[PDB]
C-alpha cells in the first residue's frame, strides 16, 4: 500500500495549472490544462524563444546595438499605459544584452517591440515567427497576435502549452534561458529587479521563468526548479489572489519533488540488447535508443524498475540502418508497463561482403 500509493494533489487557487517533468515530459498533475486563457506576459517566453533562436543561429549577438524606433517609444504610444516598461526613447542605441534583460527580467513591453523590429523587421513579421514556433512545437491551444502579451482579442494559450514553451526555452535556447535566474540588471542608471520573486526562495532552486499579470489573465506564472537529477516546470494560470501569486506554484513544485523522481535508465548509443542478424557483415545487432530515456516514477521506486523488450519481426535481416526501429522497450513497475520507448539499431549492419 505504501509502495503503490497515489499521492493526493494539493488544492491550487487558480483557474488552471499543470506540473510536468522537464526531461521525461511526464505530467504529474493537471487541472484545466488545455483551457484557452489570456496569457499576459507569459507571451514574452515566446518572444524570448524567438530571440534566442535568432541568436543561436548567429543573426545577432548580445553586444550589437539596437537603435530604438518610434514604435518602441514608451511614452509615445498610449498602448503602453500602465504596462511594464524600460522607458526607451527613439534614437537610443541599446545593446541586445540590455533589451533581452528588459524583456526577461522586467517584462518590458517597449523592449519587446524594439527587439521584434530588430530581429524580424516588423511586429507583424515577428508575430508570424512566434506562431510558426507554436506550430513547430505542436501546441494545440496557443495563438499570438502581438509581441508582448498585452491582452489581445484573439490571443490565447493554456497551462499545458505555456509549460511546453518553458520546456522548449530550456531545451533549445539554453543561453537565453540562463538569463532568467539573474536577479537584477541596470539600465539608464537604474537597477531593475527580476520580477520572478521565487528566485529568492531559499527552499527551492527556482531559476525561471515568467511571472505576469493583466486584468483579463489574473496572476500567471511559469516556474521551473531543480533538485538533484530533477527539473520540474509548473504553469499556473488565472491565479486568483495577489498573496497566492508565488505560493500556489510553490505548492505544486514542492509536492512534485516530494512524491516523484526522474530516472535516466538508458542513454543514446549504449547497448540495451543484442539480437542475431542474417545476411550481415556482423552476426549480431546492437540495440538501444536514439534519444536518452528519462522516466518519472514515484520517489524511491527506482530499485523496483524493470525493463524488457519485444521485437517487431521474427528475424533481423541485413541491411540494418542506424536508428532503424526494430522493437519496443517496456519499462515496468509492479508488473505493469509504465513507459515504452522505441528499440533501434545502434550501429549500421550492411549486407555482408566477402
Ligand atoms: B506582463 O504580464 O508583465 C505584461 C503583459 N503586463 C503588463 O505590462 C501590465 C499592463 C496591462 C495593461 C493594463 N493597464 C492599463 O493601464 O490599461 C491599458 C490601456 C487602457 C486604455 C488605453 C490605453 C492603454 N502591467 C503590469 O503588470 C505592471 C504595471 C506597471 N508596472 C510598473 O512597473 O510600472 C513602471 C512605470 C515602473 C513600468 C505600473 O504599476 O504602472
Structure overview:
With 354 residues, the chain is α+β, with helices and mostly antiparallel strands. It has 7 helices and 16 strands. A hairpin with a 3-residue loop joins strand 7 (205-214) and strand 8 (218-227). The protein folds into 2 domains: 1-259, 3-Layer(aba) Sandwich (Beta-lactamase), CATH 3.40.710.10; 260-351, D-Ala-D-Ala carboxypeptidase, C-terminal domain (Peptidoglycan synthesis regulatory factor (PBP3), Domain 2), CATH 2.60.410.10. A 5-stranded antiparallel sheet has the order 2-1-9-8-7, with helices on both faces. The longest helix is centred in the first third of the chain and has 14 residues, at 43-56. Bound molecules: ligand BO9. Ligand BO9 binds at residues 40-41, 78-79, 81-85, 107, 109, 148-150, 212-215. Residues 40-41, 78-79, 81-85, 107, 109, 148-150, 212-215 line the site of ligand BO9. It is classed as hydrolase. The entry lists the keywords peptidoglycan synthesis, penicillin-binding protein, dd-carboxypeptidase, boronic acid. It forms a monomeric assembly.
Q: Provide the succession of SSEs.
A: EEHEEHHHHHEEEEEHEEEEEEE
User: Which fold does the CATH topology of the largest domain refer to?
Assistant: Beta-lactamase
CATH class division of the largest domain: Alpha Beta
Strands ordered across the widest β-sheet: 2-1-9-8-7
- In the residues, how many domains can be counted? 2
Shape: globular
Query: How many H/I helical runs?
Result: 7
Amino acid at each position: 500500500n505504501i509502495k503503490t500509493m497515489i499521492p493526493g494533489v494539493p488544492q491550487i487557487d487558480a483557474e488552471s495549472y499543470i506540473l510536468i517533468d522537464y526531461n521525461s515530459g511526464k505530467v504529474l498533475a493537471e487541472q484545466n490544462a488545455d483551457v484557452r486563457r489570456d496569457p499576459a506576459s507569459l507571451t514574452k517566453m515566446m518572444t524570448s524563444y524567438v530571440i534566442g533562436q535568432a541568436m543561436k543561429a548567429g543573426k545577432f549577438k548580445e553586444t550589437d546595438l539596437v537603435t530604438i524606433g518610434n514604435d518602441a517609444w514608451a511614452t509615445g504610444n498610449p498602448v503602453f499605459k500602465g504596462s511594464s516598461l524600460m522607458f526607451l526613447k527613439p534614437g537610443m542605441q541599446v545593446p541586445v544584452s540590455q533589451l533581452i534583460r528588459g524583456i526577461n527580467l522586467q517584462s518590458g513591453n517597449d523592449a519587446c517591440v524594439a527587439m521584434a523590429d530588430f530581429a524580424a523587421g516588423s511586429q507583424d513579421a515577428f508575430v508570424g515567427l512566434m506562431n510558426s514556433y507554436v506550430n513547430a512545437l505542436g501546441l494545440k491551444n496557443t495563438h499570438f497576435q502581438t509581441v508582448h502579451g498585452l491582452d489581445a482579442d484573439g490571443q490565447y494559450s493554456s497551462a499545458r502549452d505555456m509549460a511546453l514553451i518553458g520546456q522548449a526555452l530550456i531545451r533549445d535556447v539554453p543561453n537565453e534561458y540562463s538569463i532568467y535566474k539573474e536577479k537584477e540588471f541596470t539600465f539608464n542608471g537604474i537597477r531593475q529587479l527580476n520580477r520572478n520573486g521565487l528566485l529568492w526562495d531559499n527552499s527551492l532552486n527556482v531559476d525561471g521563468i515568467k511571472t505576469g499579470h493583466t486584468d483579463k489573465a489574473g496572476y500567471n506564472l511559469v516556474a521551473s526548479a531543480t533538485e538533484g537529477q530533477m527539473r520540474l516546470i509548473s504553469a499556473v494560470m488565472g491565479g486568483r489572489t495577489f498573496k497566492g501569486r508565488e505560493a500556489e506554484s510553490k505548492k505544486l513544485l514542492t509536492w512534485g519533488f516530494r512524491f516523484f523522481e526522474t530516472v535516466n535508465p538508458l542513454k543514446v548509443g549504449k547497448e540495451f540488447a543484442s539480437e542475431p542478424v542474417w545476411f550481415g557483415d556482423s552476426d549480431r545487432a546492437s540495440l538501444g535508443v536514439d534519444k536518452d530515456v528519462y522516466l518519472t516514477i514515484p520517489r524511491g521506486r527506482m530499485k523496483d524498475l524493470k525493463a524488457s523488450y519485444v521485437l517487431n519481426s521474427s528475424e533481423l535481416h541485413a541491411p540494418l540502418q542506424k536508428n532503424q526501429v526494430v522493437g519496443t522497450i517496456n519499462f515496468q513497475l509492479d508488473g505493469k508497463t509504465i513507459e515504452q520507448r522505441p528499440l533501434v539499431v545502434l550501429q549500421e549492419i550492411p549486407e555482408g561482403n566477402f
